[PDB]
Design a protein around this ligand. Structure first.
Ligand SMILES: NC(=O)c1ccc[n+]([C@@H]2O[C@H](COP(=O)([O-])OP(=O)(O)OC[C@H]3O[C@@H](n4cnc5c(N)ncnc54)[C@H](OP(=O)(O)O)[C@@H]3O)[C@@H](O)[C@H]2O)c1
Ligand SMILES: NC(=O)c1ccc[n+]([C@@H]2O[C@H](COP(=O)([O-])OP(=O)(O)OC[C@H]3O[C@@H](n4cnc5c(N)ncnc54)[C@H](OP(=O)(O)O)[C@@H]3O)[C@@H](O)[C@H]2O)c1
Ligand SMILES: O=C(O)c1ccc([N+](=O)[O-])cc1P(=O)(O)O
Ligand SMILES: O=C(O)c1ccc([N+](=O)[O-])cc1P(=O)(O)O
Ligand code: NA
Lengths: 369, 369
């Protein structure tokens, strides 16, 4: 199988490359590396020589491939994909970008949840497989055990989203903001006789100053939060909030009778883990023991954390989860509203299950068929 | 009126002192400053001379006061209050601590919401007035318009709570953690060609290192979050999550038919403003514009922020609200679940309406009678 790699060099792509090396995916394919910036020089060597960098925009070159895996982004997909299909290419397009997710000829891939849908697609001529939004993938990796059994009536999701979803420059800006805050009060911070109100005043002033580094976010993130991600939609949702409902229901095959999913998506000062606080309305009063079992046994990465303070503080956080494939879920309990209302809190790495991991797993599934 | 000040030197106390000076509250009283560790030292001079610091545990000196305002804490209240009352003191005990909130003898003071309850109490011999929990006070300042009309069937609250709620040392530790994070990668950040994954790897290593300053939180807060605040209760709630339902319903006089309030309380890396993402179940499908009107007309400090991207990012954040008495609420819209589900996101300063302001306002109400 001859597989083209586009966007292998960037943040998401680099995570994907490391995972492909770790799982020895390159043993199974003939990789062809593409560039949007410079061609003809040696391709990267991740264990074996792959020749040269090819032109990511050349239709005839792409037509020679059995599949493309792209992390290059929506601008790239919009430019290349329609022409490539119009020219007769029947290969597999495996894409991280949002561009094609809701296309009638694309399947959103999250195989621990929807392997059966993926396999049906592959066997019946579907050639486009798109990774879902970070928030969607991470929520379903935590709650797949409930959703697969049709037990969810609706879900409200309030999120705590990392800088990495906006990009590497945004992550850098977050850390720079942290430095500028600390710099402003370093002379008084450690002195207990210094007024905490004076420290606080200076932090607030520094954050509000024009020179505070805010080119990417537009406003401060460190020391604060931003309760709006992406463009407004006419019903008053942000695009980020809208994605949850439409993508989750496509993945689950419920488009004609969807589970309502809604809430507020909030950016917070974390590097690359998204967390979500969920009000889950169950159709029936399911005992918490069964809920816990159904969640825990759904897949190999979800981890149900006991509902206790110390273990929660250690396990159910970005500090614990960052850079790992683990998807902890905790604070699982029935709520004051009734025994059909379930509280849950979950954390997951945005670059792994939220970006790169579904792409490499989709490749392995296609290979095995 | 002779008024004793206890806990005036701490964080909450210092905010109270600042506000009392700003509003010239000291012109209306005879202030007597007390201490737990500095007896005999000259008292602070806020305009006029108040002599020396008195003994906060000496019952007989406290007995000469017409009122006590205390920000010293629950363990202080636990020892001095019962002893002071039993010795026949009938003065006004005005307290920020949780200890007496749910005592039959005490009124929870949040006068923009429950002034009538407060005055009825004053007129019928109630002498104990206690500030509510920071999250409860801030939520009712935002949504008082809906609660006072009996429109809320239930509410789920997922919170984004600031460091100040845990204490001054915790705020310092947050800022220290921010510096330690930036320090670890400041060279790489200054080089525009550096690898984002390398920066990310170093940040994670730094946050996980034994040397990371985590004595007060127990785990990292900068770059992370902690989805547990305060001690565990038997039904799986933390004490922080439980406080909302019991305190709000007492403030609203709804103990005979309380509104269910529940959710997850999460500490994030903000300095001194709590934010809350609310799923509000309404009893009736009221038009959105009338909802906004009910909310906005309830009190002088609540503000409706239009549901638009740029203004939300600028106005509905800790960076905007910090150190002010403003209580913005935005992202007001009906949710996917139905037109009787209302999304709301609100931000408020933890030290003002969430701690010090109800104390000085209660003093002013008593004086005014
Ligand atoms: N999940 C997310 O993080 C997210 C969110 C929203 C949008 N996006 C979109 O998806 C795309 C991929 O996300 P990303 O975070 O992986 O983007 P990224 O790190 O900026 O990488 C994107 C591309 O930039 C090019 N590039 C230019 N200079 C580079 C340098 N010095 N180092 C590495 N690459 C360089 C590379 O393509 P060549 O090798 O062809 O030059 C690379 O594949 C983004 O460009 C963006 O449009 C991603
Ligand atoms: N939900 C919660 O659990 C929660 C939330 C907020 C506050 N609280 C509690 O409420 C109380 C007041 O809160 P806070 O944040 O104002 O506490 P704080 O800043 O520690 O002040 C409390 C007292 O500590 C003493 N103190 C000792 N060293 C000091 C120093 N270097 N500078 C200033 N004061 C010093 C002061 O009393 P003297 O002048 O008598 O020495 C002061 O009145 C605390 O006991 C806190 O634990 C609890
Ligand atoms: O917006 C997105 O969801 C998204 C996610 C990942 C990637 N990238 O290819 O890894 C790109 C996009 P987008 O559609 O380019 O903005
Ligand atoms: O726990 C609380 O709610 C609380 C809040 C404020 C204050 N303090 O006096 O300002 C003290 C307490 P706590 O009852 O001491 O823990
Ligand atoms: Na700026």
């Amino acid at each position: 199988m001859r597989v083209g790699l586009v966007g292998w060099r960037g943040m998401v792509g680099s995570v994907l490359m490391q995972r492909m090396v770790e799982e020895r995916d390159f043993d199974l394919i003939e990789p062809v590396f593409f560039s949007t910036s410079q061609i003809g020089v040696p391709a990267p060597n991740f264990g074996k020589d792959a020749g040269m960098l090819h032109d990511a925009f050349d239709i005839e070159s792409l037509k020679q491939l059995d599949a493309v895996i792209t992390c290059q982004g929506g601008s790239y997909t919009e430019k290349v994909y329609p022409a490539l299909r119009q020219a007769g290419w029947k290969g597999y397009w495996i894409d991280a970008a949002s561009t094609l997710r809701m296309d009638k000829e694309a399947i959103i891939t999250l195989d621990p949840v929807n392997l059966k849908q993926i396999l049906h697609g592959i066997h019946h001529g579907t050639k486009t497989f798109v990774g879902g939004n970070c928030t969607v993938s991470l929520m379903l990796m935590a709650l797949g055990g409930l959703y697969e059994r049709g037990l969810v009536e609706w879900m409200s999701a309030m999120t705590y989203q990392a800088a990495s979803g906006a990009g590497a420059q945004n992550m850098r800006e977050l850390i720079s903001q942290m430095g500028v805050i600390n710099d402003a009060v370093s002379s008084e911070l450690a002195n207990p006789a210094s007024s905490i109100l004076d420290i606080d005043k200076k932090v607030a002033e520094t954050m509000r100053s024009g020179s505070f580094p805010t080119d990417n976010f537009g406003v401060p993130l460190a020391g604060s939060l931003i309760p709006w991600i992406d463009v407004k939609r006419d019903n008053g949702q942000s695009k980020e909030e809208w994605k949850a409902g439409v993508e989750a229901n496509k993945i689950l095959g419920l488009q004609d009778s969807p589970v309502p999913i809604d809430g507020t998506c909030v950016r917070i000062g974390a590097m690359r883990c998204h967390s979500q606080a969920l009000t889950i309305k169950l159709k029936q009063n399911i005992p918490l023991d069964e809920i816990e079992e159904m969640i825990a046994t759904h897949n190999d990465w979800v981890k149900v954390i006991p509902n206790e303070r110390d273990i929660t503080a250690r396990e159910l956080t970005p500090a614990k989860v960052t850079g790992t494939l683990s998807v902890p879920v905790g604070r699982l309990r029935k709520m004051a509203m009734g025994d059909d209302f379930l509280n849950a809190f979950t954390v997951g790495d945005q670059l792994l299950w939220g970006a790169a991991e579904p792409l490499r797993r989709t490749l392995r599934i296609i290979l095995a068929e």
